[PDB]
Amino acid sequence: KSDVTAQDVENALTDTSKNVELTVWAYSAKQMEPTVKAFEKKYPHIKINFVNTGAAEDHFTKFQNVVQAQKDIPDVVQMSANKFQQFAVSGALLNFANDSIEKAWSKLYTKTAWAQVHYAGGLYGAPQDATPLANYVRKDILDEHNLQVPESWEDIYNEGIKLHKEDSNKYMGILGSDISFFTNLYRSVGARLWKVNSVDDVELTMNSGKAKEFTEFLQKCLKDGVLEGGTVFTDEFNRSINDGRYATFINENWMGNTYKEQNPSLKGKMVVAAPPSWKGQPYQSSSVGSMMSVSAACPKEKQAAALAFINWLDSDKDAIQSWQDTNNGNFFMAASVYQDDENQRNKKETDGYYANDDVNAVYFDSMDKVNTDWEYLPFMSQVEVVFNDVIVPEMNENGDLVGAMAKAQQKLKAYAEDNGFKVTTDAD
């Protein structure tokens, strides 16, 4: 049980005679590093060795490698709310839960994000960004085809048929072969793939109920040309999203900043809209986001400073402002100083990039509608492996996503059983 209190954390910042060196690994270096530099300017006794680990997939592999070796482990490591679980459960991350941290830091982060940095009763990071889904819509393409900005999945299907019949070089959307992209869609329609009761007790529902109905719908979209299966955040995707291959793109809202940075030619052409409803339920959403975690290997005498750094970077009012100023005037932060500020909710676009200037209001409404009735499995790294091996190959116009989900569930059941988890599935 961690005895580093909220007061001990604050003392690491005030006790400036106690010099500390922290090694920090991050994959979102572009967005985060300027605010890291601001930390170092403000607290020169805490020196940050900031390591840009490149792409997230490489970062997580590198971190697992050093943890398994028990050598050369960073003190602080970027995590995300749907990838940290297997690191937390395996003991790679410091569980810094205690009453005083819980009491103090729970007030600093919006409740949806704060819940998600817990796992199995431990506390494993400070939330960084929230990532409510938004639908980035090429309004120019829809206008050309006399199509409305879609508000539901039913609209995506019916309008997507018309679009692709009239212009077979464009699709209404992409079904991205990425575990976050894919699970975000299920979460955003209230379709549980699984339920976690405790660290060693899980239920898989990948082939029944609302999940099965949604999978059937996605396969019909693939079969009929409404969605195209493909990768996201690859060169293939980058070409497509620049060329207008997808009239809609339903994604975590950090993409809103990515378009401003990588796609200047799309200025004025997109509207940012709410993600779609399903079956005449009110629309729901999903938020994941990054978090900053401390390694279990972090030396005891550096832990207070490591926690002080993660809390400062992710919640200090100056830090939150830096996140805005260094990311085109907006970055969607989980800290309550951002989330509870009506002027962030009503913040108007000033750069002319999106065709609607109320982008943050769309993001905030989506955040309000995040589906919190959800947990990630303890072995999310294995989930991603099985997804790549079993589900991704079926994401095509002749695929069988329904059958693939059932086979993936069987593989995850065997993995769970082999690793000491109690597991039920809807196939039992």
Ligand X SMILES: C[C@@H]1O[C@@H](O[C@H]2[C@H](O[C@H]3[C@H](O)[C@@H](O)[C@@H](O)O[C@@H]3CO)O[C@H](CO)[C@H](O)[C@@H]2O)[C@@H](O)[C@H](O)[C@@H]1O
Number of residues that bind ligand X (CB under 6 A): 19
Q: Can residue 180 be called a binding residue for ligand X (CB under 6 A)?
A: yes
Stretch that binds ligand X, among 33-41, 95-103, 250-258, 410-418 (CB under 6 A): 250-258
Give, as ranges, the residues between 78 and 107 that touch ligand X (CB under 6 A).
80, 82-83
DSSP structure class, residue 222 = H
Q: Which does 316 bind (CB under 5 to 8 A by kind): Zn ion, ligand X, none?
A: Zn ion
Among 35, 131, 219, 285, binds ligand X (CB under 6 A): 131
Element (H, E) at 295: none
DSSP per-residue letters across 8-23:
HHHHHHH-TTS-EEEE
Stretch that binds ligand X, among 24-32, 39-47, 118-126, 411-419 (CB under 6 A): 24-32
Residues 6+ apart with CB under 8 A from 14: none
Q: Which does 277 bind (CB under 5 to 8 A by kind): Zn ion, ligand X, none?
A: none
Distances (CA, A) of 230 to 179, 240, 393: 12, 10, 10
Question: Does 349 belong to an annotated binding site?
Answer: no
Among all residues, whose Cβ is closest to ligand X?
A: 56
Give, as ranges, the residues between 364 and 403 that touch Zn ion (CB under 5 A).
none
Q: Closer to ligand X at the Cβ: 180 or 215?
A: 180
Give, as ranges, the residues between 162 and 181 that touch Zn ion (CB under 5 A).
167
Distances (CA, A) of 1 to 70, 96, 124, 316: 21, 8, 13, 26
Q: Closer to Zn ion at the Cβ: 318 or 373?
A: 318
Q: Which does 183 bind (CB under 5 to 8 A by kind): Zn ion, ligand X, none?
A: none
Number of residues that bind Zn ion (CB under 5 A): 8
DSSP per-residue letters across 151-212:
-BHHHHHHHHHHHHHH-TT-BSEEEESSHHHHHHHHHHTT--SEEEEETTEEEE-TTSHHHH
**Would you mind telling me the total number of residues written for the chain in this entry?**
428
For 316, phi then psi, to 5°, come to: -60, 140
Going by C-alpha positions, the residue among 139, 100, 137, 132 that lies closest to residue 116 is 132
73 and 295 Cβ atoms separated by less than 8 Å: yes
Q: Which does 288 bind (CB under 5 to 8 A by kind): Zn ion, ligand X, none?
A: ligand X
Q: Which two tokens stand for residue 222?
A: 């693939």
Question: Does 102 belong to an annotated binding site?
Answer: yes
Q: Can residue 129 be called a binding residue for ligand X (CB under 6 A)?
A: yes
DSSP structure class, residue 419 = T
Q: Can residue 228 be called a binding residue for ligand X (CB under 6 A)?
A: no
Q: Which does 410 bind (CB under 5 to 8 A by kind): Zn ion, ligand X, none?
A: none
Question: Does 166 belong to an annotated binding site?
Answer: no
Q: Which two tokens stand for residue 238?
A: 């980058």
Stretch that binds ligand X, among 49-57, 212-220, 342-350, 403-411 (CB under 6 A): 49-57
Going by C-alpha positions, the residue among 122, 126, 124 that lies closest to residue 106 is 126
Q: Closer to ligand X at the Cβ: 8 or 314?
A: 314
| R_g of the chain computed on alpha carbons | 22
The interaxial angle of helices 179-188 and 209-224, nearest 10 deg, is: 120
Stretch that binds ligand X, among 282-290, 307-315, 317-325, 370-378 (CB under 6 A): 282-290
Which residue do the tokens 């990768």 mark? 231
Instruction: Kindly state the smallest distance separating residue 116's Cβ from ligand X, in Å.
Output: 10
Q: How many helices (H) and strands (E) does the chain have?
A: 19, 15
Q: Closer to ligand X at the Cβ: 229 or 256?
A: 256
Stretch that binds Zn ion, among 4-12, 243-251, 317-325, 342-350 (CB under 5 A): 317-325
Q: Can residue 28 be called a binding residue for ligand X (CB under 6 A)?
A: yes
Give, as ranges, the residues between 297 and 356 that touch ligand X (CB under 6 A).
none
Under the rule (CB under 5 A), what is the footprint of Zn ion? Answer: 21, 47, 49, 102, 167, 235, 316, 318
Binding residues for Zn(2+): 21, 102, 118, 145, 164, 167, 235-236, 316, 318
Task: Please give the residue ranges that form the binding site for ligand X (CB under 6 A).
Answer: 27-28, 31, 55-57, 80, 82-83, 129, 131, 180, 233, 252, 254, 258, 288-290
